[PDB]
UniProtKB/Swiss-Prot annotation, chain B:
Family: Belongs to the RNA polymerase beta chain family.
UniProt organism field: Escherichia coli O157:H7
Gene from which the chain derives: rpoB
Protein name, UniProt field: DNA-directed RNA polymerase subunit beta
Lineage: Bacteria, Pseudomonadati, Pseudomonadota, Gammaproteobacteria, Enterobacterales
Highest taxon above the source species: Bacteria
SUBUNIT field: The RNAP catalytic core consists of 2 alpha, 1 beta, 1 beta' and 1 omega subunit. When a sigma factor is associated with the core the holoenzyme is formed, which can initiate transcription.
Function: DNA-dependent RNA polymerase catalyzes the transcription of DNA into RNA using the four ribonucleoside triphosphates as substrates.
Amino acid sequence: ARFENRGVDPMRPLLPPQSLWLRVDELFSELKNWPRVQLKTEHLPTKAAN
Amino acid sequence: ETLRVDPTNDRLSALVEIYRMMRPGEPPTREAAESLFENLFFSEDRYDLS
C-alpha cells in the first residue's frame, strides 16, 4: 500500500517490493528450512511435538 | 501529435504531472494527486458554475 502510494513521482521512482522483501509465501517456505518453535498464549489439546 | 508529445501513458503519472504543475516540489503521493484533481474540477465545494 505504501509502494503504490509512492508508485508515482518520476522524481525518485521505486523498485517493486519483490526485490527489497520476501513475499509472505516465500517466508513460509523458508520457515520450513529450520527447526522451529512456536510459543503461544493458549492451550493446544494434544499431539506430538506439542 | 499531442499523444506523441505527451510523456504520459497512464493516468497516475498524469495526475502527478497535474500535481506538479499546480504546485511544484513537495513529492506527491497517489492520494494527494487524486484528491487535488478531484476537488479541482469535480467538487461542489470549491468549484461551481452557476
